[PDB]
Design an enzyme around this catalytic site. Structure first.
Site, PDB file in Angstrom:
ATOM      1  N   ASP A 103       0.413  -1.363   0.078  1.00 54.19           N
ATOM      2  CA  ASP A 103      -0.019   0.034   0.157  1.00 54.19           C
ATOM      3  C   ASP A 103       0.656   1.470   0.329  1.00 54.19           C
ATOM      4  O   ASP A 103       2.001   1.110   0.085  1.00 54.19           O
ATOM      5  CB  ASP A 103      -1.162   0.426   0.922  1.00 54.19           C
ATOM      6  CG  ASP A 103      -1.815  -1.237   0.838  1.00 54.19           C
ATOM      7  OD1 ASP A 103      -2.313  -1.291  -0.073  1.00 54.19           O
ATOM      8  OD2 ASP A 103      -2.327  -1.709   1.803  1.00 54.19           O
ATOM      9  N   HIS A 143       0.849   4.334 -19.658  1.00 53.22           N
ATOM     10  CA  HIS A 143       0.344   3.493 -17.640  1.00 53.22           C
ATOM     11  C   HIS A 143       1.313   3.409 -17.117  1.00 53.22           C
ATOM     12  O   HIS A 143       0.990   2.996 -16.203  1.00 53.22           O
ATOM     13  CB  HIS A 143      -0.385   2.527 -18.198  1.00 53.22           C
ATOM     14  CG  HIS A 143      -1.244   2.242 -17.053  1.00 53.22           C
ATOM     15  ND1 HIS A 143      -1.524   0.385 -16.143  1.00 53.22           N
ATOM     16  CD2 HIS A 143      -2.215   2.264 -16.511  1.00 53.22           C
ATOM     17  CE1 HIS A 143      -1.480   0.516 -15.682  1.00 53.22           C
ATOM     18  NE2 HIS A 143      -2.713   1.093 -15.620  1.00 53.22           N
ATOM     19  N   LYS A 190       3.911   4.256 -14.385  1.00 52.47           N
ATOM     20  CA  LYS A 190       4.567   5.067 -12.786  1.00 52.47           C
ATOM     21  C   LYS A 190       5.545   5.133 -12.566  1.00 52.47           C
ATOM     22  O   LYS A 190       6.149   3.854 -12.334  1.00 52.47           O
ATOM     23  CB  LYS A 190       3.429   4.707 -12.121  1.00 52.47           C
ATOM     24  CG  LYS A 190       1.278   4.151 -12.282  1.00 52.47           C
ATOM     25  CD  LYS A 190       1.323   2.640 -12.550  1.00 52.47           C
ATOM     26  CE  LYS A 190      -0.416   2.418 -12.417  1.00 52.47           C
ATOM     27  NZ  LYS A 190      -0.977   3.662 -13.690  1.00 52.47           N
ATOM     28  N   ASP A 242      17.302  12.493  -8.321  1.00 57.55           N
ATOM     29  CA  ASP A 242      18.883  12.093  -7.370  1.00 57.55           C
ATOM     30  C   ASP A 242      18.973  11.869  -6.640  1.00 57.55           C
ATOM     31  O   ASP A 242      17.798  13.226  -5.527  1.00 57.55           O
ATOM     32  CB  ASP A 242      19.837  13.174  -8.170  1.00 57.55           C
ATOM     33  CG  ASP A 242      19.852  14.836  -7.533  1.00 57.55           C
ATOM     34  OD1 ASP A 242      18.520  15.046  -7.909  1.00 57.55           O
ATOM     35  OD2 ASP A 242      19.958  14.936  -6.287  1.00 57.55           O
ATOM     36  N   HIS A 276      -7.868   0.218   5.134  1.00 59.92           N
ATOM     37  CA  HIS A 276      -8.693  -0.570   4.239  1.00 59.92           C
ATOM     38  C   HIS A 276     -10.233   0.214   4.692  1.00 59.92           C
ATOM     39  O   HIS A 276     -10.808  -1.111   4.433  1.00 59.92           O
ATOM     40  CB  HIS A 276      -8.573  -1.682   2.979  1.00 59.92           C
ATOM     41  CG  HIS A 276      -7.418  -1.489   2.421  1.00 59.92           C
ATOM     42  ND1 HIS A 276      -6.766  -0.352   2.010  1.00 59.92           N
ATOM     43  CD2 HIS A 276      -6.482  -2.810   2.337  1.00 59.92           C
ATOM     44  CE1 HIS A 276      -5.898  -0.380   0.822  1.00 59.92           C
ATOM     45  NE2 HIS A 276      -5.263  -2.268   1.883  1.00 59.92           N
ATOM     46  N   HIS A 326      -5.760  -2.640  -7.098  1.00 58.42           N
ATOM     47  CA  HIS A 326      -4.708  -2.094  -8.428  1.00 58.42           C
ATOM     48  C   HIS A 326      -3.499  -2.941  -8.383  1.00 58.42           C
ATOM     49  O   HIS A 326      -3.295  -2.297  -9.369  1.00 58.42           O
ATOM     50  CB  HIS A 326      -5.037  -0.598  -7.827  1.00 58.42           C
ATOM     51  CG  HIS A 326      -4.298  -0.142  -9.034  1.00 58.42           C
ATOM     52  ND1 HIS A 326      -3.023   0.329  -8.831  1.00 58.42           N
ATOM     53  CD2 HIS A 326      -5.602   0.203 -10.345  1.00 58.42           C
ATOM     54  CE1 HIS A 326      -3.288   1.238 -10.930  1.00 58.42           C
ATOM     55  NE2 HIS A 326      -4.321   0.767 -11.067  1.00 58.42           N
ATOM     56  N   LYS A 339       0.156  -4.816  -9.465  1.00 59.82           N
ATOM     57  CA  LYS A 339      -0.298  -5.372 -10.956  1.00 59.82           C
ATOM     58  C   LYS A 339       1.338  -6.482 -10.206  1.00 59.82           C
ATOM     59  O   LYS A 339       2.778  -5.425 -10.485  1.00 59.82           O
ATOM     60  CB  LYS A 339       0.525  -5.078 -11.890  1.00 59.82           C
ATOM     61  CG  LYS A 339      -0.974  -3.709 -12.111  1.00 59.82           C
ATOM     62  CD  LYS A 339      -0.414  -2.396 -11.530  1.00 59.82           C
ATOM     63  CE  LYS A 339      -1.518  -1.342 -12.117  1.00 59.82           C
ATOM     64  NZ  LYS A 339      -2.999  -1.959 -11.965  1.00 59.82           N
ATOM     65  N   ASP A 392       7.462 -18.979  -5.942  1.00 57.79           N
ATOM     66  CA  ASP A 392       8.545 -19.878  -4.911  1.00 57.79           C
ATOM     67  C   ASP A 392       8.757 -18.513  -3.593  1.00 57.79           C
ATOM     68  O   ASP A 392      10.357 -19.357  -2.866  1.00 57.79           O
ATOM     69  CB  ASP A 392       9.698 -20.084  -5.886  1.00 57.79           C
ATOM     70  CG  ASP A 392       9.382 -21.112  -7.010  1.00 57.79           C
ATOM     71  OD1 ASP A 392       8.151 -21.747  -6.725  1.00 57.79           O
ATOM     72  OD2 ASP A 392       9.749 -21.150  -8.136  1.00 57.79           O
ATOM     73  N   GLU A 418      -2.024  -9.277   5.649  1.00 57.88           N
ATOM     74  CA  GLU A 418      -3.296  -8.028   5.297  1.00 57.88           C
ATOM     75  C   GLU A 418      -4.371  -8.799   5.583  1.00 57.88           C
ATOM     76  O   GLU A 418      -5.911  -7.938   5.591  1.00 57.88           O
ATOM     77  CB  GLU A 418      -2.843  -7.093   4.741  1.00 57.88           C
ATOM     78  CG  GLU A 418      -3.744  -6.836   4.237  1.00 57.88           C
ATOM     79  CD  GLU A 418      -3.133  -5.312   3.126  1.00 57.88           C
ATOM     80  OE1 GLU A 418      -1.929  -5.448   2.740  1.00 57.88           O
ATOM     81  OE2 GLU A 418      -4.212  -5.038   2.446  1.00 57.88           O
TER      82      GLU A 418
HETATM   83 CA   LIG Z   1      -3.276  -3.139   0.989  1.00 57.00          CA
END
Ligand SMILES: [Ca+2]
Length: 770
Positions: free
Chosen positions: A161, A292, A294, A299, A332, A621, A623, A628, A682
């Site tokens: 998060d 897309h 982000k 520096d 959340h 959201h 990705k 393993d 979580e």
């Molecule tokens: Ca979360």
């Protein structure tokens, strides 16, 4: 369909010897499934020479490999003919090098007898030295055929998060002798931006100038309440080179916007910064698609206890844009932050007319991000430089060679013998229309895994990294992703023509073939997938319904693979002990002192029902994929064709491992393990000894059972206590033959009129929704 090609097909398409504004190219299909194409050749109408090489990832049933020669002439396009190499010719793995006849639709030679020269060699997945072996040594060289090579001497910080409160995590002991310690994403980004002295480079799908990065009153930071916009304007006014590339959300597709899928604020941001010293460029895709990525690049002071005066580069990649709705913690909350950290940041795009003044639930935001240190940080910066050079403003990138005595050359932050060290590799989905500096010659392109598109060279190294990460897996895979759909070449022709869908990326089929291979070997393996309850937007909308339908078809393809493998072993078992899908939700009792809205939703709406039932999904959201407990990918790319294609939405992702914390002879108990356990804590609300080894039957059974319990709490009419955790069994059933079924009483998501199984659209072409 005869012959399963699961592996890698090396191909070279040399030329057509003689054809008896022309733009000649050739495509490669495995049966009906497109897998590659050459660039277009002009000024060679009779003897087109591509000399183009491919490393095609195969997971396909096929009888013939089919080469189609076409002319893309703008005055008219034409089919020249087709050449066929039976899969029998390559299946044994020996090199094939042939001149083959080009044929017309009746399979007779085309006029003049033209032949195409191709070379082919098939490598079955088990020919790879990491197949079912994991990373397997500290000398692992990285993913082959990519533009960016694997870097040594790196450090990755993993972010769960935007923010984590004090003392959140249980004791998760790690191999080095300490406990896992969660890092805090937006505190770290705030520090990075605030402390830069030379450059701040940012890309975003959306940027909202009015958000604050630091909001936890128990963890205040000096100046942390300043908005990101005022912070960037201040830094630029002091002389820092502040450059932004924000997706030009003026080019959005109306229908997707109207359905709720493009809730962005890029244009507003550009107006906020114009006239300041911040250089904010609105960047069209070059639309139907979006930018897309982000990214934050700065520096930063070089690690040095005494101080070196020197600087290094630090970069952030992942799912979290610097915009509205993204700030959250693992709590959340649906209702209990509406008068604190979400009072001025209320995000709820799933109800018509949602507003703070009409009350919650807000849409909580679960997401994953990362900070990259060492040479990898310069690779992210190089991506920014390539994009700025192509679609940016003036020639004002910082010139790192003029700063050799100020910013170090790309350098490690740890010795390779340090067990905290990371080896990290950068991957992208982007094409030459958006990024300058890709190699022009086919030999150099192929060495970097770059493939020809219709008009630009394509980097698809994110999909390649996923494919490789799945194939080396030996114990388990844990996915969190905003979307899960694809491999449509292998979907059932169930009310569709699969070849029309064009969601050809391999991730779902690679997952199911990996599961099948382990079943065939009698080896324990589990795949866990967490998706949002539905993708952000009105769930009854054509767009969301179409996506849920693609998701359903994808799940069905995989479960049919799994069940078929179980039955061939004589096993009668629940396939959900091999492949299990979840979503996230929360539910909060109304306690005293909570925010009281001045207004209410309309009386028989999704909004009113969700407000009264006190529940909503936690939006996934993320990705990210963990394999393993030893290898992790974090980026912007969803498991859909929009992200995996290379020439659709632009994307970025890192893949990394710690070479001293591999799953080879001992269990992997480094940072990735700590992070995975922290995520599970979580979502499940607890940790358990069985969770240490997610390949075990006891683990998946326990996770599944807990997720069923939480779905029961979530979906019940009655409410006595907060949901004890967030992981919900994805609310579908799996029929004995692999068909996805509704749960009894849940045709619709709770509080909605939206079908969980989705609805195929008769208006939206799959290019928009896959
Ligand atoms: Ca979360």
């Amino acid at each position: 369909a005869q012959h399963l090609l699961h592996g890698t097909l090396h191909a070279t398409i040399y030329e057509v010897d003689a054809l008896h504004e022309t733009q000649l190219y050739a495509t490669i299909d495995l049966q009906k499934a497109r897998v590659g194409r050459t660039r277009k050749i002009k000024n060679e109408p009779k003897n087109p020479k591509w000399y183009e090489s491919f490393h095609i990832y195969c997971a396909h049933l096929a009888s013939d490999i089919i080469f189609t020669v076409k002319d893309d002439n703008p005055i008219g396009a034409t089919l020249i003919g087709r050449a066929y190499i039976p899969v029998d010719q390559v299946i044994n793995g020996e090199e094939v090098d042939q001149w083959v006849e080009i044929l017309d639709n009746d399979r007779n030679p085309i006029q003049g007898g033209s032949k195409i020269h191709v070379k082919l060699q098939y490598f079955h997945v088990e020919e790879d030295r990491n197949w079912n072996m994991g990373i397997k040594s500290a000398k692992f060289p990285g993913v082959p055929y990519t533009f960016f090579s694997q870097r040594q001497g790196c450090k990755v910080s993993l972010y769960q998060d935007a923010h984590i409160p004090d003392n959140f995590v249980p004791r998760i002991p790690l191999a080095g002798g300490k406990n896992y310690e969660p890092q805090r994403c937006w505190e770290d980004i705030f520090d990075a931006i605030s402390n830069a002295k030379h450059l701040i480079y940012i890309t975003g799908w959306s940027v909202y100038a009015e958000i604050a990065l630091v909001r936890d009153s128990r963890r205040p930071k000096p100046g942390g309440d300043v908005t990101i916009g005022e912070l960037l304007k201040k830094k630029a006014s002091e002389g820092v080179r502040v450059l932004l590339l924000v997706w030009d959300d003026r080019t959005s597709v109306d229908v997707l916007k109207k359905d709720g899928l493009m809730a962005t604020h890029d244009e507003e941001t550009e107006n906020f910064f114009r006239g300041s010293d911040v250089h904010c460029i609105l960047c069209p895709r070059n639309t139907m698609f979006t930018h897309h990525q982000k990214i934050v690049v700065v520096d930063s002071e070089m690690p040095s206890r005494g101080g070196s005066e020197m600087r290094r580069i630090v970069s952030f990649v992942g799912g979290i844009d610097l915009c509205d709705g993204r700030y959250d913690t693992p709590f959340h909350s649906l209702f209990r932050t509406l008068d604190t950290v979400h009072h001025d940041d209320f995000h709820q795009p799933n109800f018509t007319g949602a507003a703070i003044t009409k009350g919650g639930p807000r849409e909580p935001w679960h997401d994953i991000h990362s900070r990259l240190e060492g040479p990898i940080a310069w690779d992210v910066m190089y991506n920014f430089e390539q994009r700025w050079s192509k679609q940016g403003g003036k020639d004002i990138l910082v010139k790192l060679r003029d700063l050799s005595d100020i910013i170090i050359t790309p350098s490690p932050v740890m010795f390779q013998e340090d067990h905290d060290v990371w080896n990290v590799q950068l991957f992208r989905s982007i094409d030459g229309g958006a990024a300058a500096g890709f190699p022009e010659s086919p030999e150099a392109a192929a060495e970097a895994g770059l493939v020809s598109g219709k008009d630009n060279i394509i980097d698809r190294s994110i999909q390649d990294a996923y494919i490789h990460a799945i194939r080396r897996a030996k114990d388990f895979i844990y996915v969190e992703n905003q979307y899960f759909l694809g491999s449509s070449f292998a979907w059932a022709a169930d009310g569709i023509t699969p070849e029309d869908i064009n969601a050809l990326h391999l991730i779902p089929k690679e997952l199911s073939l990996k599961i099948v291979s382990k079943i065939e070997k009698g080896e324990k393996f589990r795949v866990y997938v967490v998706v949002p309850m539905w993708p952000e937007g009105l769930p009854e909308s054509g767009s969301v319904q179409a996506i849920l339908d693609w998701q359903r078809r994808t799940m069905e393809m995989m479960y049919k693979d799994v069940i078929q493998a179980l039955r061939a072993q004589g096993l009668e078992e629940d396939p959900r002990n091999y492949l299990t899908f979840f979503c996230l939700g929360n539910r909060e009792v109304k306690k005293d002192g909570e925010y009281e809205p001045a207004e209410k939703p309309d009386p028989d709406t999704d909004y009113m029902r969700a407000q009264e039932a006190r529940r909503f999904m936690i939006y996934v959201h993320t990705k990210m994929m963990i394999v393993d407990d030893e290898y992790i990918i974090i980026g912007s790319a969803n498991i859909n064709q929009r992200s995996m294609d290379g020439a659709r939405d632009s994307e970025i992702a890192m893949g990394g491992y710690q070479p001293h914390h591999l799953s080879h002879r001992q269990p992997a108990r480094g940072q990735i393990h700590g992070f995975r356990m922290s995520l599970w804590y979580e979502h499940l609300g607890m940790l358990d000894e069985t969770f240490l080894d997610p390949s075990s039957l006891e683990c998946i059974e326990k996770v599944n059972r807990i997720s069923d319990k939480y779905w029961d709490f979530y979906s019940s009419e009655s409410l006595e206590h907060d949901l004890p955790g967030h992981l919900l069994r994805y609310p579908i059933g799996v029929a004995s033959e692999g068909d996805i079924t509704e749960l009894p009483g849940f045709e619709f998501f709770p509080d909605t009129k939206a079908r969980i199984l989705g609805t195929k659209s008769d208006y939206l072409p799959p290019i928009l929704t896959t």
